[PDB]
Amino acid sequence: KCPLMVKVLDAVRGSPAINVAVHVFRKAADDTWEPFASGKTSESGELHGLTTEEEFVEGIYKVEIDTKSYWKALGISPFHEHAEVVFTANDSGPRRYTIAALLSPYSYSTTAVVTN
Amino acid sequence: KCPLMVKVLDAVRGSPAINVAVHVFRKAADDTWEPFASGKTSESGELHGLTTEEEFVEGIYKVEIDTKSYWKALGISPFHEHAEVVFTANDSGPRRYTIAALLSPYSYSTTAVVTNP
Amino acid sequence: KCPLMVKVLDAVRGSPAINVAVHVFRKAADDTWEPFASGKTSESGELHGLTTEEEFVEGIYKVEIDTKSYWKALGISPFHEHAEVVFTANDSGPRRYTIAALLSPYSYSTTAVVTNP
Amino acid sequence: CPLMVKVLDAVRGSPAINVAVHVFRKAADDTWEPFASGKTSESGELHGLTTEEEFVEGIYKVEIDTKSYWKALGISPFHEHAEVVFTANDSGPRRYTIAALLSPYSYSTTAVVTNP
């Protein structure tokens, strides 16, 4: 039950996307994106350990998912350069955020599940 | 200008899903689905010339989209046999309805928007 | 685990859809949807224990999700009567199937992930 | 109309009206230069924000101001905005259109690309 989990699924093959480059940033006071965390999509597609409740701080985030590498490798030219999910986090306090991403070569979907 | 519209798009190819079969029914009191309308999806991925406002009634409807025939032709083995949307129609009055379909080999999404003519 | 899992989520509340009734129909040789199993979605929005691996057989199935009962409980006017997904199962070997549903008052999405264990 | 942005409201079941749309373009200094801006009509679509001559090969970014739209309608949303980053005109001239299905706490985007 990580405070930020990014479950990633592939709709073309019908299986979880495996080995997708993911990067988490953070908006700073200078309106500049600074690195915050990184990881690799497992066999099941889920992610863990990107941030902890102490490190996870109020502000604006951005989750970057590298669709270019994933579909370039598998031989289908993808449209989107990557995926980005920007959201005001911990606005009302500590909560559990789940970012779900359903990928296609030329489309993707995003969902937030807030446990509160 | 048409009351019910169904739009279908292909997610893997990033294009409208062509030549996709669609069928429409009307719910009956005895829980029997009666053939209502059926057509071939246009090159734009949208249905044209389907139904008229007089044909609509306060009864339930259901629209079926044949995804499996679509994926067989292109050569990808699909998961879904077909897609079905069941919705109570004209509870208030004669309005325009639009059903969106986003097709994938192993998924699809559907959305509904209503309009008042 | 279970050969068939159905997961239901709510878009607007960012929460799993709670207290949603589901019904599973297995097709029969008479082209009739014989009842197969039914369940109640937990607070996690998921459900298990529909059918054992032995109960599953090659054929065509159907999962029906009660959307209006969920919206009537919260009080928004539904568009969709129910959500129905139809797929051939165990076509070659005893693969595992998962059906996910993302619910909004006037839209829903369904995705299926298939694994060979 | 090299680029179009269709924006639909799931809860209301109607095209979203008056959402702020902004378009950026990658620079050699890895900087986003504001390409254009617009406002969505009652149909939920945008037209004339860019021209074919102005639209050239590169990396673009389309941002949709969902934060104001759902706050205006009175429901607190999750996403600060929607970002659709994608390389363009890599293989030559083609018409690009972006569709966004919005809900408070969820959204999906699908691009349909036409060669002519």
Features:
homotetramer; 116 residues; mainly beta; Immunoglobulin-like; three-stranded mixed beta sheet; 46% strand; transport protein
Description:
Four copies of one chain form a homotetramer. The longest helix of chain A is centred in the middle third of the chain and has 8 residues, at 67-74. Chain A is built from one helix and seven strands; from the N terminus they run ββββαβββ. Chain A has one helix at residues 67-74; strands at 4-10, 21-27, 33-40, 59-66, 83-89, 97-104, 107-114. Helices cover 7% and strands 46% of the residues of chain A. In chain A, the strands form two sheets. Chain A has a four-stranded antiparallel β-sheet. In chain A, strands 1-6-7 form a three-stranded mixed β-sheet, with no helix packed on it. In chain A, strand 2 and strand 3 form a beta hairpin. Chains in contact: A-B, A-C, A-D, B-C, B-D, C-D. The interface between B and C is medium-sized, with 23 and 22 residues. The PDB classes it as transport protein.
